[PDB]
Design a protein that fits this description.
The complex is a heterotrimer. Chain A contains three helices and no strands. By secondary structure, chain A is an all-alpha fold. The chains are: A mainly alpha, B little secondary structure, C mainly beta. Bound molecules: a molecule of 5 linked components (NAG-NAG-BMA-MAN-MAN) (3 copies), a molecule of 3 linked components (NAG-NAG-BMA) (4 copies), 2-acetamido-2-deoxy-beta-D-glucopyranose (NAG) (2 copies), 2-acetamido-2-deoxy-alpha-D-galactopyranose (3 copies) and calcium ion (21 copies). One calcium ion binds next to loops of chain C.
Amino acid sequence: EFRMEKLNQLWEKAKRLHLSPVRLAELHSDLKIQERDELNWKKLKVEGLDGDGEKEAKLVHNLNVILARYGL
Amino acid sequence: XXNXX
Amino acid sequence: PTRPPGMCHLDEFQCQGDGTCIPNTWECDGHPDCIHGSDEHTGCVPASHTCRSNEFQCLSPQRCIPSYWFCDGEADCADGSDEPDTCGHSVNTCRASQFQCDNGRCISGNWVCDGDNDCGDMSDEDQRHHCELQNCSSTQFTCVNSRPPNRRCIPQYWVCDGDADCSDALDELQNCTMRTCSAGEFSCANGRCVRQSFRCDRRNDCGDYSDERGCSYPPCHANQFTCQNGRCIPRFFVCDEDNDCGDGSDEQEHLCHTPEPTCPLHQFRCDNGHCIEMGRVCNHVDDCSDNSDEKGCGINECLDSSISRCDHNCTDTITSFYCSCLPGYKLMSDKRSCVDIDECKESPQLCSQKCENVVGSYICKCAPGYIREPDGKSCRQNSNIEPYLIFSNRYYIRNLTTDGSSYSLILQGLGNVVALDFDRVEKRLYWIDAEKQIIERMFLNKTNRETIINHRLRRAESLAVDWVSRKLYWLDAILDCLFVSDLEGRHRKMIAQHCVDANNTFCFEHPRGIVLHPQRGHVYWADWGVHAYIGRIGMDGTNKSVIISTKIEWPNAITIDYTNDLLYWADAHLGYIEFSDLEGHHRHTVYDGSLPHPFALTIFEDTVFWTDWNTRTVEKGNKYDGSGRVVLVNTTHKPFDIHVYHPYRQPIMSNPCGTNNGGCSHLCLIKAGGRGFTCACPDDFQTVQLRDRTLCMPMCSSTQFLCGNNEKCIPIWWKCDGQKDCSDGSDEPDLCPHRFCRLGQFQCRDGNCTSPQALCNARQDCADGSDEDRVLCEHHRCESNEWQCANKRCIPQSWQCDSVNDCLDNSDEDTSHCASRTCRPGQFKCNNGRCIPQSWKCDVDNDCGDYSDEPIDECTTAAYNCDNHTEFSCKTNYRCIPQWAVCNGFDDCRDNSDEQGCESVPCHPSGDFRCANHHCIPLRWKCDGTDDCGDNSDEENCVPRECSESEFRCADQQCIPSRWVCDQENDCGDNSDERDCEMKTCHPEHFQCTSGHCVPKALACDGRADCLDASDESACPTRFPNGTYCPAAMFECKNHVCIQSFWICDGENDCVDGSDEEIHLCFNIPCESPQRFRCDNSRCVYGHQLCNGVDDCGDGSDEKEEHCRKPTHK
Ligand SMILES: *[C@@H]1O[C@H](CO)[C@@H](O[C@@H]2O[C@H](CO)[C@@H](O[C@@H]3O[C@H](CO[C@H]4O[C@H](CO)[C@@H](O)[C@H](O)[C@@H]4O)[C@@H](O)[C@H](O[C@H]4O[C@H](CO)[C@@H](O)[C@H](O)[C@@H]4O)[C@@H]3O)[C@H](O)[C@H]2NC(C)=O)[C@H](O)[C@H]1NC(C)=O
Ligand SMILES: *[C@@H]1O[C@H](CO)[C@@H](O[C@@H]2O[C@H](CO)[C@@H](O[C@@H]3O[C@H](CO[C@H]4O[C@H](CO)[C@@H](O)[C@H](O)[C@@H]4O)[C@@H](O)[C@H](O[C@H]4O[C@H](CO)[C@@H](O)[C@H](O)[C@@H]4O)[C@@H]3O)[C@H](O)[C@H]2NC(C)=O)[C@H](O)[C@H]1NC(C)=O
Ligand SMILES: *[C@@H]1O[C@H](CO)[C@@H](O[C@@H]2O[C@H](CO)[C@@H](O[C@@H]3O[C@H](CO[C@H]4O[C@H](CO)[C@@H](O)[C@H](O)[C@@H]4O)[C@@H](O)[C@H](O[C@H]4O[C@H](CO)[C@@H](O)[C@H](O)[C@@H]4O)[C@@H]3O)[C@H](O)[C@H]2NC(C)=O)[C@H](O)[C@H]1NC(C)=O
Ligand SMILES: *[C@@H]1O[C@H](CO)[C@@H](O[C@@H]2O[C@H](CO)[C@@H](O[C@@H]3O[C@H](CO)[C@@H](O)[C@H](O)[C@@H]3O)[C@H](O)[C@H]2NC(C)=O)[C@H](O)[C@H]1NC(C)=O
Ligand SMILES: *[C@@H]1O[C@H](CO)[C@@H](O[C@@H]2O[C@H](CO)[C@@H](O[C@@H]3O[C@H](CO)[C@@H](O)[C@H](O)[C@@H]3O)[C@H](O)[C@H]2NC(C)=O)[C@H](O)[C@H]1NC(C)=O
Ligand SMILES: *[C@@H]1O[C@H](CO)[C@@H](O[C@@H]2O[C@H](CO)[C@@H](O[C@@H]3O[C@H](CO)[C@@H](O)[C@H](O)[C@@H]3O)[C@H](O)[C@H]2NC(C)=O)[C@H](O)[C@H]1NC(C)=O
Ligand SMILES: *[C@@H]1O[C@H](CO)[C@@H](O[C@@H]2O[C@H](CO)[C@@H](O[C@@H]3O[C@H](CO)[C@@H](O)[C@H](O)[C@@H]3O)[C@H](O)[C@H]2NC(C)=O)[C@H](O)[C@H]1NC(C)=O
Ligand SMILES: *[C@@H]1O[C@H](CO)[C@@H](O)[C@H](O)[C@H]1NC(C)=O
Ligand SMILES: *[C@@H]1O[C@H](CO)[C@@H](O)[C@H](O)[C@H]1NC(C)=O
Ligand SMILES: *[C@H]1O[C@H](CO)[C@H](O)[C@H](O)[C@H]1NC(C)=O
Ligand SMILES: *[C@H]1O[C@H](CO)[C@H](O)[C@H](O)[C@H]1NC(C)=O
Ligand SMILES: *[C@H]1O[C@H](CO)[C@H](O)[C@H](O)[C@H]1NC(C)=O
Ligand SMILES: [Ca+2]
Ligand SMILES: [Ca+2]
Ligand SMILES: [Ca+2]
Ligand SMILES: [Ca+2]
Ligand SMILES: [Ca+2]
Ligand SMILES: [Ca+2]
Ligand SMILES: [Ca+2]
Ligand SMILES: [Ca+2]
Ligand SMILES: [Ca+2]
Ligand SMILES: [Ca+2]
Ligand SMILES: [Ca+2]
Ligand SMILES: [Ca+2]
Ligand SMILES: [Ca+2]
Ligand SMILES: [Ca+2]
Ligand SMILES: [Ca+2]
Ligand SMILES: [Ca+2]
Ligand SMILES: [Ca+2]
Ligand SMILES: [Ca+2]
Ligand SMILES: [Ca+2]
Ligand SMILES: [Ca+2]
Ligand SMILES: [Ca+2]
């Protein structure tokens, strides 16, 4: 399903938390939109085109607040 | 069993 | 000398057509001087301001993208022309800046590792790309005890949290190890707890697998396919090319098969693979994929020179060709060329005796001593000696003709003859008596019977006699070994033990059946253990190998025909007779699973003879196809080890050890391959190999005695007794003490007697304790099936590390030993230290105690699938059981799966008897006298069976062996077998007491009263010179009976005369109140008979309460 290993890990562990389906579904929609965000981060990282690294803070803090918001 | 002696 | 029967001297050559002998110089000369040219065989000698030049223009988001971004696998700026028609699709690979990963995408290096789907199909981390063992930085922890398909690295955000993460859930243990857990959650062995719903399921929730161990899974739903390991999967998942349950039960060749439609006649399908009518072909209509039916209209394609290169012959059809090959030639996979058939290997049954391959056809020939009958293929034996069968019942060795016309007893009265073999050189016969555990031999004219082996024969199974090197080979099923000895029974040597294959998968567990092939120096044997096989070893103990290991469950029988050199064996469970080459290749079934229970087979000419246990019949038939099956005889007892007696079944061969014992000191054994020979030493000898000879240095334990000539060494209790055992005679020296005990029994230094097992068992048993003496027990050694504690007491090899104090000083259970020891080859080792059979691994049952033998993750993989030829797979778990355990009346699958629906199970048509319940039992178990069906349906409606020659009939009409008649004890349950003996003569070499009963003669005039009336001692000459019959230590009853001195007047009527209980002797015997106290009639009553309620002495003083109640509770 998800591209990255870490999103899959969060997805199995979210199911291990037996969270409510509406909360659990909103988790993936926030992570799947982050999936497209991380992909452009990663492309600009290996190619080195992200000379300022602006795309890293905005998904790191988003993941942190995602963990806090949804009860993880 | 059935194969012993 | 003369000429061998029906053969010729090696100095000459045998004609095939008439069996006449001519010199070899007339062979291979080119002139067919024989009757049919058999001498001359052919085998002889012959806008633009919004973007920049570095970026590709896009419309809607007002973006501009680099030139290498587009046409990589996705539309970077949502451009519909990005992928399809902007770059060449495959004019080039995606170049070095993006490493190759699939054709439609490419990968820029590190992505082959991280675990993110960067090639579009996860194939970035495929094969052996990268990331063999991932690492964890700060705020991360590694799941070290894990495999690729679970996890290896997790953050501290999940260590000692509320939910297990790693494979073994070590993240929650760490140093945390909390206490609080209540009844609201299931409790695991390691201490962690989980919700009750997470018990007995498909997930490893607790890490320790405690939530799964011991569970009993209910069966799956109707829409749920079940795998062999017990995992339920949706039936939609079946045959989707994904291993949905690990073991691959849902992804296998024939379950996921869609056989193509037959369309046998008409219905001419075209080459694209769909069936269409025959008339549509070349109907000028393109109804098939690509002109499959229209070649314009077809013609033969072989007509042009070497097109398709049909090697032998060609033929055409409406739209194709097909080459063909002449008989004796087969086409190979290229569909154009032909190769020669090796009919001697591909189709052995064409020639009756021997085959020679020719390019094209084949020629059949006969071994020397056989002539080919005018049919061109069937050889006939030329000797004027007619063969006859020799097979063994439990009590008899019986003589039966090949056609079954005659039937007579060779011998009778034996205990249990389980095997036999013959020697044509001395016209002698050998057999194993399993009841007496001895090996005997006698001439075929029924004289000079003798016993050659009688010691350390725990359980012998089968024997074979080597006519060339004069060696005797036999198998032991308890020691799991193959022994060797000369025909006289000396120089015993172990030549095989443990396992055979390099993987130690096939090991000696249940040896049975043996056949020698001295021409190539090989011994073939069979084992019907869990991993049944047919092994092979050289006659000298080299070249261990496995011949047959597949489609074999119960190989009771094995033999070689010596004329075709084919190996023959039979399976009792699968019920077949199947033959193969000497190397195990090119197997062919004679009987396809139709035989009830064969035990031994043998070959002669064209006929196989086998003994059947279930029908108790001897049967014969053709050796190649089984036609002409005929029942020869049918007996009351089971038949064992049939043999065809004929000199052609032991072909003449030169002896490598000829007339010199090969120069070997003790044993000369034929080398593997037959050409050479190898010197060997017996069991208790050390092979100190020298420069040009082998030294057999004696090496015998402190409980053994070395004979005078160093010819052998024998147990220490065999020294100083009645019989001379050594050849030198040092067994019985002049300075030999008196022998107080019987044969085969250790004698104490003070005259007491004890069994040999009492020697060096750390429990002193002799009066002096001499059985545990330091000099005797210093170098004690025991059998290969036992392990010796440092206490120097021997226990069975499987009694180690079982939390049971089998030895006195816990040396078997010592933790240091239980961690460093190995298991013997073929056995599995537990973390507990237990050694268990390899079959016990992954069978649900907790055998190690620590569940080390049941790793649930590994036991459910494809590596432990049941052998579908012989084993039945349990429904609700991964256990496999043999097919013969199915609905036998016992829970073998631990979920009662094998006992479900036995009504649908049909019995074998002839060998079984259906019970009242739907179980099938062997027919030999009908009316046997014991309930075997579980409901007494086999023994109901029965009639007693008639007695045989060696049996005697009781009043209850039940037959017993005649040896039990008049032996002082009743066996019929009443007075029947001792009804009268006074006017009856009894089996020879037996002494008849005056009361009519008779005992073995060796028990006469030996002190002990072995007759009931002591008549075996009442008339004997004076044992000692000065007139005495007993040594002083023993007492002498007036009827000449010897008696231990301390038995004097102990209350037991020990002398049958009664001289033991004279009051004048009784009064003066020393006594002690706790053991022997005086009754007021001057009789020292035994202390155990006080307050017993019985008048052991005639005034009741032994029952008076005053001195046998408890004064201080005593
Ligand atoms: C049942 O069948 C068996 C087997 O056929 C018979 O046993 C054979 O009996 C014959 C006699 O009829 C034996 O022949 C004699 O062999 C001697 C040499 O071998 C024996 O002695 C050596 C000594 O070490 C042993 O190792 C060996 O095992 C043998 O015991 C010869 O020296 C004898 O020669 C003498 O007699 C012949 C004529 O018979 C004369 O020409 C000679 O000059 C000389 O006087 C003799 O040839 C034969 O050896 C036996 N076989 C075996 C294996 O021992 C049984 O006799 C037979 N029983 C019955 C009752 O039918
Ligand atoms: C195994 O078989 C042996 C056979 O010996 C039994 O062991 C002891 O056997 C002796 C037989 O003599 C028992 O009786 C003992 O006799 C000794 C000899 O008597 C001396 O004195 C007389 C006096 O006229 C002389 O004529 C004679 O020549 C001797 O000089 C006594 O000396 C013994 O008493 C002493 O030794 C025993 C242990 O041997 C002690 O128990 C006594 O307290 C005392 O010190 C004795 O009278 C003797 O009883 C047998 N032993 C025991 C313990 O009973 C074994 O009994 C038998 N196995 C078992 C298990 O019973
Ligand atoms: C008719 O014939 C029998 C024998 O044919 C006689 O029985 C013998 O009687 C004598 C005298 O009692 C016995 O000799 C004594 O044996 C004692 C026990 O030793 C036994 O065990 C050892 C070791 O295994 C054997 O070597 C030995 O043979 C015995 O089996 C010894 O201990 C005696 O020596 C003791 O006394 C002397 C002094 O006399 C001391 O100096 C020694 O140190 C020692 O303490 C003695 O050797 C003989 O063993 C008996 N033999 C049998 C077979 O029983 C009958 O007595 C005889 N009948 C009549 C009426 O005379
Ligand atoms: C299939 O093709 C093969 C290969 O040609 C055919 O074998 C050939 O068959 C012919 C006719 O039987 C044989 O010819 C005969 O040869 C002898 C000499 O040996 C000659 O005296 C006869 O007059 C005759 O010509 C030929 O030997 C044989 N070829 C070989 C090398 O074996 C076969 O007949 C074809 N089969 C069919 C059914 O088409
Ligand atoms: C098992 O049974 C077979 C068949 O009954 C026995 O074969 C018989 O063997 C004896 C001894 O070789 C033969 O006796 C001989 O007969 C001839 C002719 O009458 C006589 O001149 C000889 O002096 C001798 O007495 C007998 O003919 C032969 N029978 C057959 C059918 O071949 C065999 O001996 C038995 N085996 C055992 C171990 O008892
Ligand atoms: C005892 O018998 C076993 C089972 O037949 C033998 O195990 C064999 O071990 C080799 C090497 O581990 C396996 O080859 C492996 O194949 C995989 C691909 O499937 C590859 O990725 C590995 O690099 C390796 O080449 C082989 O599959 C396996 N046998 C079978 C038929 O599965 C073992 O060799 C025997 N004795 C020993 C030395 O333990
Ligand atoms: C010692 O043990 C080995 C294993 O049992 C024996 O080797 C086996 O010998 C047979 C007969 O020579 C071989 O069969 C032949 O193999 C060749 C190909 O090498 C093939 O062209 C023939 O048609 C035939 O199948 C068998 O393969 C071979 N097995 C192996 C792998 O060793 C050896 O003969 C034994 N030595 C003795 C004489 O004790
Ligand atoms: C086997 O038993 C049958 C009866 O069931 C009998 O007719 C036959 O003669 C026996 N076989 C022989 C030839 O001994
Ligand atoms: C199962 O048996 C078939 C024959 O019916 C055989 O071809 C196949 O190899 C066997 N498969 C297994 C699991 O051994
Ligand atoms: C002649 O020699 C052959 C060799 O196989 C046999 O021993 C045969 O028994 C002999 N014949 C006689 C009559 O002694
Ligand atoms: C006595 O005769 C019976 C019947 O004939 C048995 O054969 C028994 O074996 C005989 N024993 C003796 C000692 O002659
Ligand atoms: C008893 O037999 C012994 C054995 O040595 C003596 O020969 C003795 O003479 C025999 N007779 C008597 C009366 O003892
Ligand atoms: Ca010739
Ligand atoms: Ca692109
Ligand atoms: Ca990746
Ligand atoms: Ca956790
Ligand atoms: Ca679970
Ligand atoms: Ca599947
Ligand atoms: Ca067509
Ligand atoms: Ca051929
Ligand atoms: Ca065994
Ligand atoms: Ca098996
Ligand atoms: Ca069977
Ligand atoms: Ca002896
Ligand atoms: Ca003891
Ligand atoms: Ca133990
Ligand atoms: Ca187990
Ligand atoms: Ca069962
Ligand atoms: Ca029964
Ligand atoms: Ca009796
Ligand atoms: Ca006696
Ligand atoms: Ca007594
Ligand atoms: Ca009493």
